[PDB]
Design a protein around this nucleic acid. Structure first.
Ligand SMILES: [K+]
Ligand SMILES: [K+]
Ligand SMILES: [K+]
Ligand SMILES: [K+]
Ligand SMILES: [K+]
Ligand SMILES: [Mg+2]
Ligand SMILES: [Mg+2]
Ligand SMILES: [Mg+2]
Ligand SMILES: [Mg+2]
Ligand SMILES: [Mg+2]
Ligand SMILES: [Mg+2]
Ligand SMILES: [Mg+2]
Ligand SMILES: [Mg+2]
Ligand SMILES: [Mg+2]
Ligand SMILES: [Mg+2]
Ligand SMILES: [Mg+2]
Ligand SMILES: [Mg+2]
Ligand SMILES: [Mg+2]
Ligand SMILES: [Mg+2]
Ligand SMILES: [Mg+2]
Ligand SMILES: [Mg+2]
Ligand SMILES: [Mg+2]
Ligand SMILES: [Mg+2]
Ligand SMILES: [Mg+2]
Ligand SMILES: [Mg+2]
Ligand SMILES: [Mg+2]
Ligand SMILES: [Mg+2]
Ligand SMILES: [Mg+2]
Ligand SMILES: [Mg+2]
Ligand SMILES: [Mg+2]
Ligand SMILES: [Mg+2]
Ligand SMILES: [Mg+2]
Ligand SMILES: [Mg+2]
Ligand SMILES: [Mg+2]
Ligand SMILES: [Mg+2]
Ligand SMILES: [Mg+2]
Ligand SMILES: [Mg+2]
Ligand SMILES: [Mg+2]
Ligand SMILES: [Mg+2]
Ligand SMILES: [Mg+2]
Ligand SMILES: [Mg+2]
Ligand SMILES: [Mg+2]
Ligand SMILES: [Mg+2]
Ligand SMILES: [Mg+2]
Ligand SMILES: [Mg+2]
Ligand code: NA
Ligand code: NA
Ligand code: NA
Ligand code: NA
Ligand code: NA
Ligand code: NA
Ligand code: NA
Ligand code: NA
Ligand code: NA
Ligand code: NA
Ligand code: NA
Ligand code: NA
Lengths: 122, 50, 49
RNA sequence: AACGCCCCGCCGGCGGAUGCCUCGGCCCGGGCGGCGACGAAGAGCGCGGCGGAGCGCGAGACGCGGUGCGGACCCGCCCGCCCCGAGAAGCACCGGCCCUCGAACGCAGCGCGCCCCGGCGCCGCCGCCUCGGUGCCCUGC
RNA sequence: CGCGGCCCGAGGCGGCGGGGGCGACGGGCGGAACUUAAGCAUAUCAGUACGCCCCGGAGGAGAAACCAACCGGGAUUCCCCGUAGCGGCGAGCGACGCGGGAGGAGCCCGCCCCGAAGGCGCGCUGUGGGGCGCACCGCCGCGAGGGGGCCCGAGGGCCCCGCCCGAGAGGGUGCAAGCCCCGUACGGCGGGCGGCGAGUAGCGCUGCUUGAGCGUGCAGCGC
RNA sequence: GACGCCCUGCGGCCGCUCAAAAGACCUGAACCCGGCCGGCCGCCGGCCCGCCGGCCCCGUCUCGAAACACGGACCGAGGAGC
RNA sequence: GGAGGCCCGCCGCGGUGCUGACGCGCAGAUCGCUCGUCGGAGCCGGGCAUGGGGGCGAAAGACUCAUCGAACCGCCUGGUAG
RNA sequence: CCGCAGAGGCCCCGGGGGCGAAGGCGGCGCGCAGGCCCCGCCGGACCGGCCUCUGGUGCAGAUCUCGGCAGCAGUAGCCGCUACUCCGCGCCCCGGAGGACUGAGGGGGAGACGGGUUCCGCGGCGCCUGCAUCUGGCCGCGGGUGACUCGGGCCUAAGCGGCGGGUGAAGACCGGGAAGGGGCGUGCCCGCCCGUCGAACGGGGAGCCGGCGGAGACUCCGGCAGGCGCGGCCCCCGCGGAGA
């Protein structure tokens, strides 16, 4: 029952917006029917489907918008904080791996003239 | 009293909506042994402190 | 309105009554799950390297 | 006498010991060692077809989407699914939504501002723009 | 009366940081009394409870202004082993070295030489470079072998005769089940020269602290 | 928790399901109590069984407890030299 | 003419005597008569301030939420006991 | 030495068990005793003789702890607030009739605080209504609170907080000597220095009548008015008196 996001991803923004408007309108109609009279099985059956349909359409719209916006800031120096890589606070505030391996030049020179070798005893 | 803030009024509103029994179809759907809700209150006996 | 919370060691029962783990702990649960079995470590390694 | 009271042989109450059983506790070892202004921990208030408590979730609310696996049910009444895939229950990871308070950030706690275009908290470091000084000088006047 | 440089300050803008949470372990401060002494005031309890502040997956400590007195050792930490001493010399309190193990790793800056060679809107009130002469977890799977009779509400019961075994750990099933079901045993995949730190070290007086005793460590003031 | 029969209704009887009512529930002790049936005052001893003889309330501190010294209505379970 | 920390007296605010009732209470301080005061150093309500060896006191060691010759809560603490 | 719970072994074709284990009740026998054994009834799935090992291992008492429960006993008690009766119909509900009371500092009519749905309609008697109940503030199911003019939101009181900073090991506490804002409109001009904190009784711009429901009314509807803003059209820069 209800729509599928599969064939929903194949519409334009305006079409999805209109679809959402109609879904919300008829959701209000079903709420009125529930509030008055009595809950016949068919309208109550349609009710749950309509709620999840609204959910699905909103999902599709937001995903499309996010993809466009993310493509807008692909190569900038500063991007919105909602697109930066997912990490924790502690690992965000940390030195990278090459910064940890840096050495002063004198120690670099020393550690190159005496490299590690393989040997066996006896 | 008759001169209350909306904040106090909203917390007392939730207490009234929650003072209900266990529905009959719930008791038998879950096969319940104890059929009374012991989180109910009565105005003449309680102190809500809200 | 003090910035810190009122906690005292001479009563471990009140600490027991209100503390971390007595609520939902939504964000902490999600992060712990993503770390123990997930891709948080791979992401961190790629970001640091 | 008799009744009442107190003592044997059967039958009933009241009460809940004992015995047997327990998805619970307690100790020892091992692993892990991961939260937050990108809004934490905690609190409030809401969300179900018929819905009180608890769990869960957040006006997209008793859940939405993607990728794999699974393969007939769905605690009541209903609704739904049924098939060489057409897809119920379940499982893992990933992407989003995310009301009011809260370190809690226009003021204040439920009321009210400034602004011109949308937005309006504090402290620090770096950099830039606009300036002050009978500070040390210099020039012109 | 004006305006340029340097110096010392003020308002705004941009980008980055901080704040709070966590009955353990860890670091730094403040700091009791009950109690024992058969009373009690120094002592003890105790450098404990508790209060405040601050990190991490560990922290702290760490490459000698060290021990020692030997036919010597050689940064730090942790384990095993054991009496000098302090003390109304009462009650009580109390280290270290040598020896045997776990583990094992080394280094820099300033000062001195060059001087923008630099991370170049900064910086000569010093960036950058150098010592100078002699010589183990996770993921995925398959998984064997029993019948007959009696009797019970139901046998996993009783009698007889069998099979599987790298599996006779267990759990479920209408009564004690290797062979009724799930599992158990046996797999695969991914991972000579120059130069050494000042209101410092030390000393006097005072307070706390230690086994440290005409001073173990710290601190205030004066020098 | 069938059916049937009484009942102004409340309820009752008879039976039904089950191996069993095990009927809001395993087993179901003691104290206390109701009915029916047998007896007449506690313990010890003798006996053909109600006669004879003997018998102060325990635990505790204490020179000394039946004490007008203290604790103890009754029953169950727990309860103190590791 | 209409002064007064003047007098009699209602509501209020108090609390004398009966040593009345009650005293397993209506009540962990009440009830009935009788009584003191009643324009003032009077009485009542709300807001605000003072915090524990401290406060506040026309002073009784009084009061500080049934607790005061030193409140209450948790911990030291299963404090010590010839 | 007897007994309790558990561990390691034995129990001659591999200890006893739905042909009935543990536990309960009654009755013999054995032992100086602590105790043990057997039989009958109940019950419905486990149990232990001997050797070695282990311990949170044996109750009459502690003004012992927790639970249950007796006599007393159908006893003490159901004395304030003057009071009910007849008929429908029942001392208590409803109706009519009679008889009384509270007695305008009300057992009346309304608010503040506190309570939080107790409010209204329909139904009911399982609980409660210390007697009863057909009653109910009890139980079930549905409903119910409308503002330009009433109050809060604003002001300030006694007070509280904040304030470049100051102090303290901190937590925190104390605080005038500090380059401390606006306007019109883009350039100029003015200017030492906090608070949209604190009063449903103080200050405050403006509301009356009639009617309607089952439960709301200065709020709804009808009528008649007030106050404060904004937008259009016309649309004006003062005269009288001797003086008040
Ligand atoms: K000490
Ligand atoms: K005595
Ligand atoms: K006595
Ligand atoms: K005190
Ligand atoms: K006001
Ligand atoms: Mg709920
Ligand atoms: Mg906010
Ligand atoms: Mg705020
Ligand atoms: Mg800034
Ligand atoms: Mg002690
Ligand atoms: Mg002493
Ligand atoms: Mg002593
Ligand atoms: Mg003493
Ligand atoms: Mg010591
Ligand atoms: Mg370190
Ligand atoms: Mg198999
Ligand atoms: Mg088995
Ligand atoms: Mg040196
Ligand atoms: Mg000392
Ligand atoms: Mg005899
Ligand atoms: Mg005799
Ligand atoms: Mg004694
Ligand atoms: Mg004595
Ligand atoms: Mg004597
Ligand atoms: Mg005696
Ligand atoms: Mg016992
Ligand atoms: Mg006068
Ligand atoms: Mg007078
Ligand atoms: Mg009297
Ligand atoms: Mg009396
Ligand atoms: Mg003082
Ligand atoms: Mg059975
Ligand atoms: Mg034991
Ligand atoms: Mg006993
Ligand atoms: Mg009587
Ligand atoms: Mg009268
Ligand atoms: Mg009223
Ligand atoms: Mg009513
Ligand atoms: Mg009710
Ligand atoms: Mg008004
Ligand atoms: Mg108003
Ligand atoms: Mg105000
Ligand atoms: Mg007013
Ligand atoms: Mg009007
Ligand atoms: Mg009304
Ligand atoms: Na902090
Ligand atoms: Na961490
Ligand atoms: Na059973
Ligand atoms: Na005697
Ligand atoms: Na005594
Ligand atoms: Na007694
Ligand atoms: Na007088
Ligand atoms: Na006195
Ligand atoms: Na104690
Ligand atoms: Na038996
Ligand atoms: Na014991
Ligand atoms: Na009448």
């Amino acid at each position: 029952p209800g729509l599928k996001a599969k064939d929903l991803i194949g519409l334009s923004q305006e079409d999805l917006q209109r679809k959402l408007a109609d879904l919300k309108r008829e959701l209000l109609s079903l709420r009125t029917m529930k509030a008055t009279a009595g809950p016949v099985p068919e309208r109550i059956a349609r009710f749950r489907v309509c709620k999840k349909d609204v959910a699905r359409v909103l999902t599709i719209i937001n995903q499309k918008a996010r993809d466009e916006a993310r493509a807008a800031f692909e190569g900038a120096k500063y991007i919105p904080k909602t697109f930066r890589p997912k990490l924790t606070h502690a690992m965000r505030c940390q030195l990278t791996d090459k910064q940890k391996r840096l050495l002063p030049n004198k120690v670099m020179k020393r550690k190159l003239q005496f490299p590690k070798l393989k040997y066996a005893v006896k | 009293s008759a001169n209350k803030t909306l904040e106090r009024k909203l917390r007392l509103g939730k207490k009234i909506r929650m003072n209900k029994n266990i529905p009959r179809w719930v008791i038998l759907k879950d096969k319940l042994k104890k059929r009374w809700n012991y989180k109910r209150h009565h105005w003449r006996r309680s102190h809500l402190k809200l | 309105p003090s910035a810190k919370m009122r906690r005292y060691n001479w009563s471990y029962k009140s600490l027991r009554r209100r503390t971390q783990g007595t609520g939902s702990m939504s964000h902490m649960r999600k992060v712990y799950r993503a770390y123990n079995s997930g891709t948080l470590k791979a992401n961190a390694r790629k970001y640091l390297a």
